[PDB]
Amino acid sequence: SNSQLITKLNSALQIATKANFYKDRLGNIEIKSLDDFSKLPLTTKEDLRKLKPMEALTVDIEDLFQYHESFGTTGEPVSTWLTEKDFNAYGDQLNEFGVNFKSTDIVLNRFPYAISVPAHIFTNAIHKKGACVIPVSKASAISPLKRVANLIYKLRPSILTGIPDELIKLNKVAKFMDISLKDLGCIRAICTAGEMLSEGRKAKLESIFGAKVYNYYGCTECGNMAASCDEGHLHISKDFYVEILDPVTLKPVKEGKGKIIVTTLNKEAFPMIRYDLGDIGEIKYEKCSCGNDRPVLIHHGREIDLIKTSKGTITFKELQEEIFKLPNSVVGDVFRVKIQNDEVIVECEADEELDNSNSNLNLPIEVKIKRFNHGEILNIDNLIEIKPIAKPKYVEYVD
Amino acid sequence: NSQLITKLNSALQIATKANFYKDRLGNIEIKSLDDFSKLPLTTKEDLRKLKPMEALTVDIEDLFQYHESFGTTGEPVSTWLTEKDFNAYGDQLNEFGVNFKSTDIVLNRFPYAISVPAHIFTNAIHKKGACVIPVSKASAISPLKRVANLIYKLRPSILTGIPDELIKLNKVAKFMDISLKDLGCIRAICTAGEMLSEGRKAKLESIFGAKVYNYYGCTECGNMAASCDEGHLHISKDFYVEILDPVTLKPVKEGKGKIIVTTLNKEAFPMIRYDLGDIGEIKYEKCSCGNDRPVLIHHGREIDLIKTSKGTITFKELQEEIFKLPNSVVGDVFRVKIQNDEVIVECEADEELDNSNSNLNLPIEVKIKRFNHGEILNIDNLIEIKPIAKPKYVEYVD
Ligand SMILES: [Mg+2]
Ligand SMILES: [Mg+2]
Ligand SMILES: [Zn+2]
Ligand SMILES: [Zn+2]
């Protein structure tokens, strides 16, 4: 049934248009098809920024339950009220695919509970299956990586969750503490989210931790649009309608990569009608061997993370996919990307310098691997510090 | 008493599931509070020596949350919780305290990192249908400047945070030309995690123009007590509180003493006669609030006692007298130095006090040393905003 999906898209509009923002550019216009839908104006990040938090609201103050934002201080941020239902929906989305949380599971939650949502909805999800949350958080004086390393050694949790960046550092700090988190033999699964994950970097994470990885694709304003199957592919949540548009035309593509627009099927506080995530990807419709009937998504990363020389363009994913076919000797787990004077330079902490003259990348553009020394791009001494913290110290005996 | 005694016994029967408690309590029953008071105290330093699996009376399946001493300075105390237990903690916050309505938007300035107050306040607030703004604390993500803007923008109806932070919040905000009081949106405050004199409570109320509710709790127990409308803490029904003599360690007949607590309603690892290391006293005069539960007077930590040769006072008693002085000579920023057998209170304030004819109505000598605003507490340290964003892996050069 398109009949259902179309019923839903319409509901979403009827709620949305409770709010000035949505009414003064969608009125009471109904729709009869996806194509008639695709005629409707996109909703941009920069649109929502201009909104007071009371302008980003389709429910009564009474139904408010949580609040969230852009964690980033760089750029005006986006109010995202949630009702209990909405919050609970987000959580269910994490459970819809992803790893199978058991009650016997103890889960180290390394996502920031400060203002972001992934921390909170993962908790929601995990509690739902009867498992235990260790609220370590992130970017808190309270829980630097040394402590997290000790926490894992001590508590032996069965699942780690954290943005793949932090998880790579965690393993570095821990290895500098003479701890192989992998050999503990207690971590069966990982939950990455908050940055795009190549199959190459996913396979890196799996080799480090010796665990299966489940990746979760979401955002504050929407919820969690997709997550990994056992086979490794993201799948799209039933609570969303995902379109792939052409960067320039802004029309549905016939196939292949494109801008990722999402509409909320199941969020009532302020629904996302055709929201421009600003990412790149593609929906496949071949049924995954996992057996799940929902459609697979290939995430190519953010739009600004496209690699554009004169001689072509590639997605950050495509770049990464090729980087990480090279040995760890030449690439490693710490890298950044400079595009300058019409060349692509990947700077990598690694032991060996690469031929480059015999690099033999299978990309439509030229990419060089510039070698660095471990610790030069990522300073380990910055991560190992522990600030002592406690309650205020008001009463001093000078003895 | 038959109820309370039934409960104390249950607590022991669970507790002794754990070697820690069994190898010093066996299956000993009790018939009275007095027979209870014969049992060995449980100390902070006791629990520290426990592996997290040794601090556990339930199966891994029933585990739900985990927590610790937030400080990275000093070995920490494992505190598992089951869903029930967590839910109990929350209910304790709701048992007295402020009355959370569904029309309430609450800025939650407690750290969600490892501590519990942040999480159980959320629990409580959701329970009444109100909205949580999870600002947290000690996170790069949420410096005071942002919190000030967040309040200006979202106009929340309730702030929650340790009174120290809340005093700073108002400083940072006032330096940003924002009077949080004149917003007209904050009706209530929820202090916790440090002791609160009636004088400092009244200070907070003057700053924010809101009523204060204080909450007295700890990670291992839950939240043992919270304020009534009248101002007085009351003890939660989920706990048995004793006041012991500092030296003898026997029930006192009346007055101040060491505060020991037993968990009536926590099953993962119950606190049997736990030494908080605080000082206080139970009154049984009924508060005019009409709540029948007994009032508690919190005097602060033991190490925060003021001991000269010429006597001794509680941090509260000291504070209570400090803050009867004009605002001109005592503000909201103070510290306490005891040196060469004198008590010096250093205060940011405009006027110097005529200590040569000082009022102070205490059994010991206490001098008020005047300082300039911003010299004890540097506002410039707090106004910084650290830029944070996702990782930045792709750079276009030039
Ligand atoms: Mg469990
Ligand atoms: Mg509400
Ligand atoms: Zn699949
Ligand atoms: Zn009362």
Numbering used by the authors:
A (entry chain A): 3 to 401
B (entry chain B): 4 to 401
Paper text:
In this report we show that the ligase ClxA, from Clostridium cavendishii, initially reported to have roles in amide bond formation in the biosynthesis of benzoxazole antibiotics, is an effective catalyst for the formation of phenyl benzoate esters from acid and phenol substrates using ATP in an aqueous medium. ClxA was also reported to accept alternative substrates for coupling, including 3,5-dichlorobenzoic acid, which could be coupled to 3,4-AHBA 1 to form a precursor of an analog of the bioactive compound tafamidis. ClxA therefore presents as a possible biocatalytic tool for the synthesis of pharmaceutical-type amides, particularly those that use anilines as the amine partner, as these had proven to be poorer substrates for the amide bond synthetases McbA12,13 and ShABS14 studied by our groups previously.
The observations on both chemoselectivity and substrate specificity of ClxA prompted us to initiate structural studies as a precursor to structure-guided mutagenesis. Two datasets for ClxA were obtained (SI Section S6): The first was an apo- structure with no ligands bound; the second was obtained following co-crystallisation with both ATP and 3,4-AHBA 1 and features the ligand density described below. The structure of NatL2 and ClxA are characteristic of a subset of adenylases in which the active sites are completed by reciprocal sharing of an extension to the C-terminal cap domain. ClxA, with only 29% sequence identity to NatL2, features many local differences in secondary structure compared to NatL2: for example, NatL2 features a longer N-terminus and C-terminus and an ordered helix (P373–R388) that is replaced by a shorter region of less well-defined helical character (D353 to N362) in ClxA.
